[PDB]
């Protein structure tokens, strides 16, 4: 919303399905940094049941 | 580079210069928003356009603030030959000066600002409404000499539009004749539209320099209109 | 030795998961209210698909 509303440039025209495409693919790679910790943490030392 | 060919390699030097003068040009370019001032040469258009020669073969490079701006300028009128509607089609914005002031080729006017903004190829682009010579029309409403009556018959029944901006002191007859005559335009506007593109109205006067302000803001608003829906959030 | 641990039959696990129904349900609940007016201005302004 920022950058629509921050055009002094003409307009964009950003063609093809690649608008919905680049949220997505930006929020994967904040989600991906997220699993990527994960995946290390549960395959190294994950977490157990302890009585 | 290779082979030892000795002048090709300074015709590719050249060529890099060369591409370098066009990337350079590449920016202005892309910057620049784009206007066709249509019109009847009645409308004042002339005025207007001096006005931007003051105010940053019938062009206009006119600089407002940072951002630059050209005006094909082509006729675009009932007469005139000027059928490069087609060319020059990707646009900023459509600059549409009306003389408000005579009433008769008023409804010429009308006409075509009916074709302009039904062309399937302009469509898409917007209309900036200069309503200008709007102090004659002024003077005209103000004495009983010429009455809107005249040409256009349902001028009664017409009572000033709700927030239609009063200027303090203008006579209320002038002001009603005023917004009757730009109510007029957008009648036209409304029809054959999925709202793509939107007549943005304003009143000039061939005495006016804050014209460049006004195209300014309209674009600047054109632009934003058309990134939003462009990203689907209008 | 008494076995504790948080759970779905203790009265404070009931109102817990009573809660995350709750949240489930409003969650649905502004989805359906999303979709029934996909296309109204509110929707598209806040970006429907995210």
């Known amino acids: 919303v920022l950058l629509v509303f921050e055009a002094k440039i003409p307009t964009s025209f950003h063609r093809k399905w690649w608008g919905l495409n680049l949220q997505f693919l930006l929020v994967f790679l904040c989600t991906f940094m997220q699993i990527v910790i994960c995946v290390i943490w549960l395959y190294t030392a994950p977490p157990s049941s302890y009585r | 580079g290779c082979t030892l060919s000795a002048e090709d390699k300074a015709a590719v030097e050249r060529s890099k210069m060369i591409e370098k003068q066009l990337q350079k040009d590449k920016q202005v370019y892309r910057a620049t928003h784009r206007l066709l001032l249509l019109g009847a040469d009645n409308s004042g258009k002339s005025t207007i356009v001096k006005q931007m020669r003051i105010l940053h073969i019938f062009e206009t490079k006119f600089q407002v603030d940072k951002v630059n701006f050209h005006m094909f300028d082509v006729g675009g009128q009932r007469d005139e030959r000027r059928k490069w509607i087609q060319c020059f089609n990707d646009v900023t914005a459509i600059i549409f000066v009306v003389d408000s002031s005579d009433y008769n080729r008023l409804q010429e006017a009308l006409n075509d600002f009916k074709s302009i903004w039904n062309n399937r190829w302009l469509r898409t682009i917007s209309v900036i409404l200069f309503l200008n010579k709007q102090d004659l029309l002024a003077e005209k409403v103000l004495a009983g000499k010429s009455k809107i009556e005249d040409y256009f018959p349902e001028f009664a029944r017409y009572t000033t539009p709700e927030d239609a901006t009063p200027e303090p002191g203008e006579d209320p007859r002038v002001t009603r004749a005023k917004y009757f005559i730009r109510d007029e335009f957008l009648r036209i506007s409304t029809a054959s539209g999925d709202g793509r593109h939107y007549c943005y109205p304003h009143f000039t006067c061939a005495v006016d320099t804050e014209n460049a302000r006004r195209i300014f803001n309209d674009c600047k608003d054109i632009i934003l209109q058309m990134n939003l829906r462009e990203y689907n959030l209008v | ?50």
């Open chain 3, 1 to 50: 030795k008494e076995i504790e641990f948080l759970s779905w039959t203790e009265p404070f696990g009931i109102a817990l998961t009573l809660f995350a129904v709750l949240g489930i349900f409003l969650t649905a609940f502004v989805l359906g209210v999303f979709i029934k007016f996909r296309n109204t201005p509110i929707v598209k302004a806040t970006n429907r698909e995210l």
